[PDB]
């Protein structure tokens, strides 16, 4: 029947004080016949009331999607407070409860290393720059790329991989035109993680 997802906020949103992090409670496969969904929210078992209620939207088989988004406070999430969405619908035997919070455990800061293009990489029209990150906990992290205070969006980052010591690692590849690299422009991978000083660090690389 009706199925519930509770998504945590984007790591960038929780680590940047200028952004507003939010938990999202998504209910799918809500029948046309019993479409009303009632959301209850709880922060550490204590009910709160500021949640926003989006209007329903058509889905496949005479079903609706209904969503409810709750703004969280950076420090609440970071302090490990537990967020609960309670979903009630007439077609439900009992209400459905989902629980999300930041992983518990000693925060470990990421170690970042950069890899310039190989000799072969330099023969192509487009070169790739790589950023290796390890040693971090929890797995919540944001990796983005910039050059000259402008975003560089042509990158791909792997999901964090669990390490045998309990921490996490990943890599990120940015592809840029070779002419831009040849010109001498500096490129940076920016890493945001809870355990970094001010949640932010940056490694750079340019043509030698």
């Amino acid at each position: 029947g009706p199925s519930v997802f509770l998504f945590p906020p984007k790591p960038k949103d929780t680590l940047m004080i200028s952004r507003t992090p939010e938990v999202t409670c998504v209910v799918v496969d809500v029948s046309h016949e019993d479409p009303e969904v009632k959301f209850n929210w709880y922060v550490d078992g204590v009910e709160v009331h500021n949640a926003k209620t989006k209007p329903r939207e058509e889905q496949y088989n005479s079903t609706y999607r209904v969503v409810s988004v709750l703004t969280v406070l950076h420090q609440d999430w970071l302090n490990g407070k537990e967020y609960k969405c309670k979903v009630s619908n007439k077609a439900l035997p009992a209400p459905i409860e989902k629980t999300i919070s930041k992983a518990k455990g000693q925060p470990r800061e990421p170690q970042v290393y950069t890899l310039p293009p190989s000799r072969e990489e330099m023969t192509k029209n487009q070169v790739s720059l790589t950023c290796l990150v390890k040693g971090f906990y929890p797995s919540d992290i944001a990796v983005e790329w910039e050059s000259n205070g402008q975003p560089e969006n042509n990158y791909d980052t792997t999901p964090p991989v669990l390490d045998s010591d309990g921490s996490f690692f990943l890599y990120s590849d940015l592809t840029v035109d070779k002419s831009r690299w040849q010109q001498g422009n500096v490129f940076s991978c920016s890493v945001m993680h809870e355990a970094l000083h001010n949640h932010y660090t940056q490694k750079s690389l340019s043509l030698s």
Binding site: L15, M16, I17, S18, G149, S190, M192, N198, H199, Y200
Partner: peptide, 13 residues
């Protein structure tokens, strides 16, 4: 001191 990402405020200490 404060960290900034692409002209946007990250965090202060």
């Amino acid at each position: 001191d404060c960290a900034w990402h692409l002209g946007e405020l990250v965090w202060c200490t």
